[PDB]
């Protein structure tokens, strides 16, 4: 079998992306954050505290014919940016695309944090990294794309998402007509639970291509582009006007100036985010300081290839028994 659907920006600065799936029977459509960097598919319901509802789609397991409790089950997730929910779980009918598992868990949020009332686009999350991060309790449970692993044509996902514009998630094969080139594959460690590989190096602008060994993830659920400190400096150094700001949490930069490109390694080969891809707009409405796309790591623990990054290629998301990323410019 195979899947394919169209992942599309929430909003004007790619802040990220949603996905329709279909849950239940009949089917209820949700909007929900495709996440290479997390394991729970977890969704707003009927069982979510009603004043952390705002906007959002929400999953009724009551009015699905194939939705079960899975009886005893909890889990609770907190994620890098500080935003956490909880809840109980189901199991249920899950379709992506054209591509069906039976049986998936469904995470049913009775708790959100803030942030995700406060964003009436996102549905909730699916979970695509390694299902030994799944944080259901007593019995971890396991990620869409492990369930469906074994019935697709190939054991793969790819992400293919848009600068500005929509994109697509296929699940089971490789869409040769989607990328320019050919596809570098690099080796993928799962010790941590991530699609963790290491980038050759960096290049900023026209610069020389700096070969360094950059241990990162590659992670559809983070917006940015985090890297280490001194591979950051490197670039903003090469903006007009930019600086770090503690105030403001970041690299910010007037928008009167122009980005350069920034080259990741993969391999010998080597993936070009354009400039354009790294301004994410006014710090406030009105301000003339942008915010920039690329960000120091130091103090996460994890250098993280984001959206900023994994947008600028087609990215393979190889699932074989031993694990591989595959990155082509396109």
Do not use: M, R
């Given at each position: 079998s195979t899947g394919s659907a169209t992942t599309t920006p929430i909003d004007s600065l790619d802040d990220a992306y949603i996905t329709p799936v279909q849950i239940g029977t009949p089917?209820?459509?949700?909007?929900?954050?495709?996440?290479?960097?997390?394991?729970?598919?977890?969704?707003?319901?009927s069982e979510t505290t009603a004043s952390e509802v705002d906007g959002q789609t929400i999953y009724t397991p009551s009015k699905s014919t194939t939705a079960k409790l899975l009886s005893g089950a909890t889990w609770s997730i907190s994620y890098g940016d500080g935003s956490s929910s909880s809840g109980d779980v189901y199991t249920d009918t899950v379709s992506v695309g054209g591509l069906t598992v039976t049986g998936q868990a469904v995470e049913s949020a009775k708790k959100v944090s803030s942030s995700f009332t406060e964003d009436s686009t996102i549905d909730g999350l699916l979970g695509l990294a390694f299902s030994t991060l799944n944080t259901v309790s007593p019995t971890q449970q396991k990620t869409f794309?492990?369930?469906?692993?074994?019935?697709?044509?190939?054991?793969?996902?790819?992400?293919?998402?848009?600068?500005?514009?929509?994109?697509?998630?296929?699940?089971?094969?490789?869409?040769?007509?989607?990328?320019?080139?050919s596809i570098t594959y690099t080796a993928v460690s799962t010790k941590q639970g991530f699609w963790e590989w290491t980038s050759t190096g960096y290049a900023v602008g026209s610069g020389t291509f700096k070969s360094t060994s950059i241990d990162g993830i590659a992670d559809t659920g983070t917006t940015l582009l985090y890297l280490p400190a001194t591979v950051v400096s490197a670039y903003w150094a090469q903006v007009s006007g930019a600086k770090s700001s503690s105030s403001v949490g970041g690299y910010v930069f007037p928008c009167s100036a122009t980005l350069p490109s920034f080259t990741f390694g993969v391999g010998s080969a080597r993936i070009v985010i354009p400039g354009d891809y790294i301004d994410f707009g006014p710090?406030?409405?009105?301000?003339?300081?942008?915010?920039?796309?690329?960000?120091?790591?130091?103090?996460?623990?994890?250098?993280?290839?984001?959206?900023?990054?994994?947008?600028?290629?087609?990215?393979?998301?190889?699932?074989?028994?031993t694990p591989t990323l595959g990155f082509a410019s396109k």
């Open positions: 089917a209820q459509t949700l909007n929900l954050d495709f996440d290479t960097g997390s394991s729970d598919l977890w969704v707003f319901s794309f492990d369930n469906a692993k074994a019935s697709l044509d190939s054991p793969v996902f790819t992400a293919d998402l848009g600068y500005h514009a929509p994109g697509t998630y296929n699940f089971g094969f490789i869409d040769t007509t989607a990328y320019t080139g710090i406030s409405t009105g301000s003339s300081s942008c915010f920039g796309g690329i960000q120091s790591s130091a103090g996460i623990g994890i250098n993280i290839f984001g959206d900023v990054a994994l947008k600028a290629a087609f990215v393979v998301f190889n699932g074989a028994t």
